[PDB]
Design a protein around this nucleic acid. Structure first.
Ligand code: MG
Ligand code: MG
Ligand code: MG
Ligand code: MG
Ligand code: MG
Ligand code: MG
Ligand code: MG
Ligand code: MG
Ligand code: MG
Ligand code: MG
Lengths: 75, 105, 185, 62, 141, 144
RNA sequence: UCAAAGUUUGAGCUC
RNA sequence: GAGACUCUGGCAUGCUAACUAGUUACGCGACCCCGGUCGGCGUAACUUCUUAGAGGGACAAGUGGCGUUCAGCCACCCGAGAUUGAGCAAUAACAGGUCUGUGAUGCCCUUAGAUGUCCGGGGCUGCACGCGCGCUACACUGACUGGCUCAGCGUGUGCCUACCCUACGCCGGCAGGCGCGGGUAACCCGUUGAACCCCAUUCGUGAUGGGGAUCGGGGAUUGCAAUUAUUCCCCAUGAACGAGGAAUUCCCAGUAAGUGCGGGUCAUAAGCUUGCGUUGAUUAAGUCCCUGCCCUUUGUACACACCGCCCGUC
C-alpha cells in the first residue's frame, strides 16, 4: 500500500540545504534524515558520518543495529 | 566489562552502599553454572555478600548490620533468593506445557 | 556517586506528579526508580508484587511483542533507554512527567462488562496496565517498516500521547469506547 | 460535571460473569463526608482510588 | 600493563590487522580473495584483509586457551547454520581457511607447536599481544 | 560521492541484461545473467573494488571488467569449482556460458533428454516432483 | 422484567 | 484413592573419607611498572572446595482478628528453606485403536497341478483436488559481515556385527586425504572449547540480503540397489506472504514466549520423535458468565440413555 521511493544522492542545492538545516535538528539519525528528505538510511548513515568527518555533529550512541547522532550540545 | 549492556545492573548495589565500604577491598569474582545473565545477576549478589561477610567476620558486626540494613531498606531481592529456574519441555506435546495437540477434523 | 546521588544527570527532588488522581498508586518516586527497567524479576508473582514492579519495567514488558522479540529484554530496554533520553531531548520535560501524562490520558477510567454490557470505572492496576499496553501497540504500529528507529519513534510516541493528539491507536480505542458507552449506558 | 476521586472503604461484593466486578462503597478524599456505591471491573481492593467523570451512575448489585 | 581482556575487541581486530600488515610478513595465502568464510556463510568477510583478522582471533584464542587445533578453533568458532525452513544446527568453520590461518601464524612466529601437541603462544607472540594491547589501550584511553 | 556522479546510469546493460543502480555493488551486478551473488562476489575479489560503494557509483567500465572476467573466467583467473558452467557441453573448454548461450544450452538439455527418451526428460515434460514430494499434494496454482 | 438452539450407517447394544 | 511412600533439590566448613579430586602455606623463572601472570617447576599434611556412604535437618516456629478461642483461614511478621520437583496414580467407560512387533493369538479356511515358501522388482513417495500435525515468512526492537562468551543434556573401538572417542603437524569451499599419540575412560575424548550476550561496520523500510518452497546443469559422499530427487556439496530462477477476517492452538513464575544444544534411532545423521541448556514477561488471588467440570435439589413418556424419544399430511 505505502512505499518509500528514496533518493540515493544529494544534489548541490540539497547540499546547501543540508549544510544549513540538518545540524539544527536535535535528533540526527540516518533514519531521521531519510524520512524527512526521502533518502536511504545507509547513505544517510554515511552522510551523518560525513558531518562527523567535516566536523559538524557530535555522537550520542552509535551501535551496529541503531545509531544516534546530534548537533553538538546546544548550550 | 562485557556484557556492557548489563553494567548498571552491576552497580546498583555498589551505588546503594557507596564506595566507602568497598574502598578497603579488592575482590575478584569467580563464576560458574547457569547462563551469562543468570551468572551476572549472581555475581551482583555475591560481591555484596562477600563484603558483608568481610565486616561481619574479620571486624566488628555493627558494620555488617549497617550495610545489611541499608540493603534491606533499599531492595529485598538482594536477600530473598531467586529460586527461579528454567522449566523443561515435557513429552506428550510440541511445547513445554501443552499435552499433545488435540486435532479435530 | 556514593554518598549524594545525581542519578546520572537527574535530580531526585523537583519532579512534580501533576494529576492528583494517580498520585499514591503510581508508586514512582524516591525509591522505586532504578537504573534500568530490567531487573531480576519475580514482579508478577503475587498480586501486588506486580504493583511494586517499577513502571519503567512495565513499559519494557509491554514493548516486547510480535514473536521475534519475546524475551529480548536488554534490547527492548535499550529501546526504552534511548527513547526516554530522546523524549527529554525534544520536548524538554522530565520523561516520567510526559509519561504520567500518558498514564493519565491513555488509562481508561472505565470499561464495560456483563452485569448488553454496562460500563464501570476500573481499578488502578488494570487501568495503568491498560495505558502502558495501549501506547506500546501505538509506538510499534507507527515505527513498523520505516527507517526511523523504534527507540526514536517510541520517544515521539510518548510525546504525542502526553499531548493527546487523537492520532494514537490508544486514543482511537478510548474515543470509540467512550462515545459508544454514552449511546448505550 | 467535574471530576471526582473516591477511595474504596469497603468491598461489597463481586458481580459479573466471573464475579469480576466489585460493587464498592467509596469515600471521597475531597469531601471526606460523601460516599457512594458502584461496581468496578478489573482487580479491585478495599482502598484504592477511582477518577469518576460522574459519581451519579450506580451498578445493580446481585 | 594491558591485555586482550582489558581491550574492547572491535577496534582490537582493526589495530591488529594494521599491526600485522605493518609487519608485512605473514605470507598471506593466494586464495584469500576467492575464499568464502564457511560453506554455510553467504558472503566473504567484511574486512578486506580478513585473513589477518582471523589470524588475530585464532592466535588470541590460543592465548586464551592454548593447544587449540583446527577442529578446536572451529568448535569455539561454530554457530548457526540458519537452515531457513529446516531446523538450525551447529556449524564448524571452513577448514581450508581455518587451517591456513593457523599455518600462517605458525609461519610468522606468533604460534608454536608445543611438545606433547597443541599450540602455545611464543615469546614473540606474547610480546606482540601486550604491545598491541598497550597501543589499543592508548586508543580507548 | 555525494554530488551526483557523471553519466549516472539509472540502468546499465550487460549481456543484453539491464542492471539496477539501487542495489549495492556486489548484489547489483548479479542482475547480470550467468553470474550470481557469490560468483559476482568472486569477480569483485579478483577486481580492485571497495565493495562498500554503491552500484550507482561504479562506472560502465567496471561492469564491463567484471563481465569480461566472468565470460572468460579461465582467461581472468576464476576457479573451475566456482563456475556456473562446470564441464561445458560443446567443447569442454572453460569459458562462461551466458543468457542466450544459456537458453540455447537449455534447448540442448531438452534435446538430450528427449532424444534418449530418459525418464527424467519425461519428468521435465510431465512436470512431476522429482525431489521426493507427494505430487498428490502439490502444484495447484498451475493445475487449475 | 424472556425474538432462536433442527438432524445424525442399513453394515450387528444385550443375560 | 488423595496423602503417605521412593528418588531428586536444599541445611549440614558436622561423622566416615580420596595421586583417576584437589588444597592451603611459600619460593623460584620470562617479561611489565617488590610484586602481578603462567594448564612452567619444587616443599607436606588435610579434606575448606570436590566426590558419596551413613546419620542428622523445619515444624504453622511468632503474632493479630475470626472460630466451642476447637480445626484452622486471611493477612502480616518471623526466617537460607513456611508448597523443590517428579514417578506412581481410584472405581468405571469409548464397543475410537492395536491379529501392522514376533513361533503374541482364538476361531474359520488353505498346503504340491499350492493361496506356502525362495530370488528380483514394485506400491507405501503413483496425482486435476482437500484437511490436520508441522516448517518458513511479511523485516531495522532487525538482517547482512567480522570479533568477543558462561552451559546443560551427552558419547567413545560392540559375542554374532561390518561402523569408536579422539589429542598433536600437513591437503579440498564442501564431501573428504598423509604423519605419530592418549583413552575401553574422573587418566584420553573434555576446562563437556553452545548460542545468546557484548563491540564497530554494512544494510535501509524494498515482495528487501525479508521468505527459501520448486528445479536445470554439475561435484562428493551414504548404500547391493533410490526413477518416488540417498545424502552433502557448487552456481542460478526465486510463489504467495507489507503482522492475520469468522474461526482456533498455547500460558500465572523462571511460567508463557525468543534462541540455539544433545540423545534414541544412528551407513549419509534429526526432516521422526524425545530431551538439553540460554534470555525472560503480562495478567488473576477473583469467579464459575463462556467452556468444561464437581455436588445438592428438581422434573422426565429417555435407559442400546438428547448423537434421545416421538407426531401428522402426502
Ligand atoms: Mg561461539
Ligand atoms: Mg422459538
Ligand atoms: Mg444413517
Ligand atoms: Mg500420595
Ligand atoms: Mg502374531
Ligand atoms: Mg530376490
Ligand atoms: Mg526500523
Ligand atoms: Mg533468499
Ligand atoms: Mg536465487
Ligand atoms: Mg409429574
Amino acid at each position: 500500500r505505502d512505499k518509500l521511493n528514496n533518493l540515493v544522492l544529494f544534489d548541490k542545492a540539497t547540499y546547501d540545504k543540508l549544510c544549513k538545516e540538518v545540524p539544527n535538528y536535535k535528533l540526527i539519525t540516518p533514519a531521521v534524515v531519510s524520512e524527512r528528505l526521502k533518502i536511504r538510511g545507509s547513505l544517510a548513515r554515511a552522510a551523518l558520518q560525513e558531518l562527523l568527518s567535516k566536523g559538524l555533529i557530535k555522537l550520542v550512541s552509535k551501535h551496529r543495529a541503531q545509531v544516534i547522532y546530534t548537533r553538538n550540545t546546544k548550550g | 566489562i562485557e556484557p556492557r549492556t548489563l553494567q548498571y545492573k552491576l552497580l546498583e548495589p555498589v551505588l546503594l552502599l557507596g564506595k566507602e565500604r568497598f574502598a578497603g577491598v579488592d575482590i575478584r569474582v569467580r563464576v560458574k553454572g547457569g547462563g551469562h545473565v543468570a551468572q551476572i545477576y549472581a555475581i551482583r549478589q555475591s560481591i555484596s555478600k562477600a563484603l558483608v561477610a568481610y565486616y561481619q567476620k574479620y571486624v566488628d558486626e555493627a558494620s555488617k548490620k549497617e550495610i545489611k540494613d541499608i540493603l534491606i531498606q533499599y531492595d529485598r531481592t538482594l536477600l530473598v533468593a531467586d529460586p527461579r529456574r528454567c522449566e523443561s519441555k515435557k513429552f506428550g506435546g510440541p511445547g513445554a506445557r501443552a499435552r499433545y495437540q488435540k486435532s479435530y477434523r | 556517586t556514593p554518598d549524594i546521588k545525581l542519578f546520572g544527570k537527574w535530580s531526585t527532588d523537583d519532579v512534580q506528579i501533576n494529576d492528583i488522581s494517580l498520585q499514591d498508586y503510581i508508586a514512582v518516586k524516591e525509591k522505586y526508580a532504578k537504573y534500568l527497567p530490567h531487573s531480576a524479576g519475580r514482579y508478577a508473582a503475587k498480586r501486588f508484587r506486580k504493583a511494586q514492579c517499577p513502571i519503567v519495567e512495565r513499559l519494557t514488558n509491554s514493548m516486547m511483542m510480535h514473536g521475534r522479540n519475546n524475551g529480548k529484554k536488554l534490547m527492548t530496554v535499550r529501546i526504552v533507554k534511548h527513547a526516554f533520553e530522546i523524549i527529554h531531548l525534544l520536548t524538554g520535560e522530565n520523561p516520567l512527567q510526559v509519561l504520567v501524562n500518558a498514564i493519565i490520558n491513555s488509562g481508561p477510567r472505565e470499561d464495560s462488562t456483563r452485569i448488553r454490557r454496562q460500563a464501570v470505572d476500573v481499578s488502578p492496576l488494570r487501568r495503568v496496565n491498560q495505558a502502558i499496553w495501549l501506547l506500546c501497540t501505538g509506538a510499534r504500529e507507527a515505527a513498523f517498516r520505516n527507517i526511523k528507529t523504534i527507540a526514536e519513534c517510541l520517544a515521539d510516541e510518548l510525546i504525542n500521547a502526553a499531548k493527546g493528539s487523537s492520532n494514537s491507536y490508544a486514543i482511537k480505542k478510548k474515543d470509540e469506547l467512550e462515545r459508544v458507552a454514552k449511546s448505550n449506558r | 460535571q467535574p471530576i471526582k476521586l473516591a477511595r474504596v472503604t469497603k468491598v461489597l461484593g463481586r458481580t459479573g460473569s466471573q464475579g469480576q466486578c466489585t460493587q464498592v462503597r467509596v469515600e471521597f478524599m475531597d469531601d471526606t463526608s460523601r460516599s457512594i456505591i458502584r461496581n468496578v471491573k478489573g482487580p479491585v481492593r478495599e482502598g484504592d482510588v477511582l477518577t469518576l467523570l460522574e459519581s451519579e451512575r450506580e451498578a445493580r448489585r446481585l | 600493563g594491558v591485555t586482550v581482556k582489558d581491550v574492547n575487541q572491535q577496534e582490537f581486530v582493526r589495530a591488529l590487522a594494521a599491526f600485522l600488515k605493518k609487519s608485512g610478513k605473514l605470507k598471506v595465502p593466494e586464495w584469500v580473495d576467492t575464499v568464502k568464510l564457511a560453506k554455510h556463510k553467504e558472503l566473504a568477510p567484511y574486512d578486506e584483509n580478513w585473513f589477518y583478522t582471523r589470524a588475530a582471533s585464532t592466535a588470541r584464542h590460543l592465548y586464551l586457551r592454548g593447544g587449540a587445533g583446527v577442529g578446536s578453533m572451529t568448535k569455539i568458532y561454530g554457530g548457526r547454520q540458519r537452515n531457513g525452513v529446516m531446523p538450525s544446527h551447529f556449524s564448524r568453520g571452513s577448514k581450508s581457511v581455518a587451517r591456513r590461518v593457523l599455518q600462517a601464524l605458525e609461519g610468522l612466529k606468533m604460534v608454536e607447536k608445543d611438545q606433547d601437541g597443541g599450540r602455545k603462544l611464543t615469546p614473540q607472540g606474547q610480546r606482540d599481544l601486550d604491545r598491541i594491547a598497550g597501543q589499543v589501550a592508548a586508543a580507548k584511553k | 560521492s555525494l554530488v551526483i556522479p557523471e553519466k549516472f546510469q539509472h540502468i546499465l546493460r550487460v549481456l543484453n541484461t539491464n542492471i539496477d543502480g539501487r542495489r549495492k555493488i556486489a548484489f547489483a551486478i548479479t542482475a547480470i545473467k550467468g553470474v550470481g551473488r557469490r560468483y559476482a562476489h568472486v569477480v569483485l575479489r579478483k577486481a580492485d573494488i571497495d565493495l562498500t560503494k554503491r552500484a550507482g557509483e561504479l562506472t560502465e567500465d567496471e561492469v564491463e571488467r567484471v563481465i569480461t572476467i566472468m565470460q572468460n573466467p579461465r582467461q581472468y583467473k576464476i576457479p573451475d569449482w566456482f563456475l556456473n558452467r562446470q564441464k561445458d557441453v560443446k567443447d569442454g573448454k572453460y569459458s562462461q556460458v551466458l543468457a542466450n548461450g544459456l537458453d540455447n544450452k537449455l534447448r540442448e538439455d531438452l534435446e538430450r533428454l528427449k532424444k534418449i527418451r530418459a525418464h527424467r526428460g519425461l519428468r521435465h515434460f510431465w512436470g512431476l516432483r522429482v525431489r521426493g514430494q507427494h505430487t498428490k499434494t502439490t502444484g495447484r496454482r498451475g493445475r487449475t
